[PDB]
């Protein structure tokens, strides 16, 4: 079985100033392919060391993938290094140069000269287009082998990689992942409900992963086994599974709103906007989402419809219902969501961090759910948002 | 300057099934020492591969630190591999085997037969006591070179490493690092601006790291050189620097509001709440942030005071200004921020994804800034949030 080598370029990665997720993500994406990954490197932004790593990786591998160091600064050296490692000169490509000048002209700026080095390639490199920045990628095919250069930021390289991967002509293996997402049920109760279906072999395995949007049950391994097995697991978890694969809670809400021809608004205290943020993450949200109020002070809550009588008692079911009713009547939406309670670090009104009420107000009346969430400030905020969305999809 | 290599061992670190923070925490602890860390590695639990990597590492390094693979399973193989790499045999240490039997008797159990291997050591190795788990570590001195084996889990290895590290006799140098956080200046421009101050020598180095919150400029190396080059660099870039070190934009905004005794509110369209969300990330936001609105429909935009004549050009500096001044009057706040623009993926009002206006209104007037962000929907939304916060800290 042939080897893939994966190097993430960046001095900041050595020290975790940025945590290297790229090498693991790229390794995860290679699972459907018969290549072995024996190691992954993080390498400093330095030519001679980087060139040596590349020279070695290339000699042993069917595929070498790199990330990072495709920028314009003296710390961007991946191209020089790869050129050194493969013993080819850098040549300026005038057409890509022009694409870079146009990118800057479009912003009413002059292209700084430094950028020229991004238009630079070796004779065996093909370009990988990067519409999301100035740093295009490389794809070198040489002696049966592939070497791909990718930009550091994920928002840049993910699409680039998606595009080039199938074309590499790597040998396939019938590997699958199925991710089933649940809400309102802990890991143990899941393992219990599954019983024997909770298998863990060389062929197929099943895991629980706790996440802020509920516990995921991940089935992986051989395609056919993942298929039969996940089918039975969804079966036995029919009540708690809200979605699969790339389905999110915000997207299940969008599909319910468009089915019903219904609208939504929000009123938020502890979440500070995050619940609006999360509804609007999904493209097409303006088809149903009218807007929201972040009522972060006592003046804001009164102004936008929460009774006076309730302003000194914000950690309460009564408050979360009043906020959801306030937003629904202000905006005129079919449905309205509200989040109130204690994020952390400090307790509030004699209640501890993680004490949260989420409310849904709709045509037939309001509902409130009390939660007691584990985690720090930002984790409690996150789980609150998902619990608010869950009032609509579970 | 001599090399330090750092290897994390475990197949699950390659795939990020477990997140490798060990190699980075080790690299950081090595800072006060005149060693160059050129790379960090993660390696599969496989004896022949790991051996070759230890061998290559040991050949080129003054220090080699391995993490993990010290358990009892057929997949814990670090000892064998070190053994093999250094051409020395594994020996049972009866005393350490005794300590391992005491560990299991303490829990009322017999030691399983697998745990035998945890007492193997090579002749060149002294023992490193693990008083929090079963596997002790090794310190190997040979050829004027050190090689340390450490357990995987951090509560085990951290006290072990902290103990052995000052004994290794590594050469010391006074280290510093300064982290300058800027907004509103591109990476190419930072280079040009800084000119000959963008040093990359052995003693001293200056690096740029793009983030969604702004380009970070990092100086690291010899202490006297770092303070000098950071103060001149900060002088060149004085307008664009909003924070140092751990500072986030939300925190800087917080510092300015408290400093002046001032309040803030927001009005958001394309960001959807993510501005309020980022502001309220920081404990004690309630002391200055009164709240905000998310004006995501045309009706909400009118309800909350975008002028009617602007409803068909929401993508404009005119509308941003008016959103800001409305939010201000609506909450009675000293200042207010607004965002408006095209998130993507679709154009709006004839303008392409990435076209964004942010605005700040205050007691002496308002100001607007326009951007053309190149990335996907989620990146545009996040760059916008930081673009707005930057208006208060320039
Ligand atoms: N391996 C990685 N894992 C996660 N994030 C990364 C990784 N590499 C880089 N990043 C993020 O992306 C930025 C990219 O840095 P780098 O300067 O290497 O990219 P580049 O290839 O030069 O491309 P660009 O000029 O497009 O940023 C880093 O500051 C970091 O925030
Ligand atoms: N590189 C790493 N970075 C951060 N955490 C790690 C790393 N490696 C391991 N861990 C943590 O500790 C565990 C490591 O298990 P591993 O088998 O590597 O340890 P070991 O040295 O064999 O000793 P033990 O038998 O006590 O696990 C992981 O499951 C994870 O919690
Ligand atoms: Mg770069
Ligand atoms: Na920040
Ligand atoms: Na807002």
Numbering used by the authors:
A (entry chain B), B (entry chain A): 1 to 394
Quote what the paper states about this structure:
Here we describe the determination of the crystal structure of CinA from T. thermophilus (TtCinA), which contains both the NMN deamidase and COG1058 domains and is therefore a bifunctional enzyme. In addition, we show that TtCinA adopts a three-domain structure, with a third, previously unidentified, KH-type domain between the NMN deamidase and COG1058 domains. We demonstrate that TtCinA adopts an asymmetric dimer and present structures with NCN, ADP-ribose, AMP, and ATP bound, which provide experimental validation for the modes of substrate binding proposed previously. We use these structures to propose models for both enzymatic activities and suggest that large scale movement of the COG1058 domains is linked to ADPR catalysis as well as providing a rationale for the usual asymmetric arrangement of the TtCinA dimer.
Data were collected from three different complexes, following soaking of TtCinA crystals with ADP-ribose, ATP, and AMP/ribose 5-phosphate. Both the ADP-ribose and ATP data sets produced clear difference density in both catalytic sites (top and central panels). There was no indication of hydrolysis of ADP-ribose or ATP; this may be due to a slowing of catalysis in the crystalline state. ATP binds in a very similar conformation to ADP-ribose, with the γ-phosphate occupying a location similar to that of the terminal ribose ring. Mg2+ binds between the α- and β-phosphates, as in the ADP-ribose complex. ATP therefore appears to bind in a manner similar to ADP-ribose.
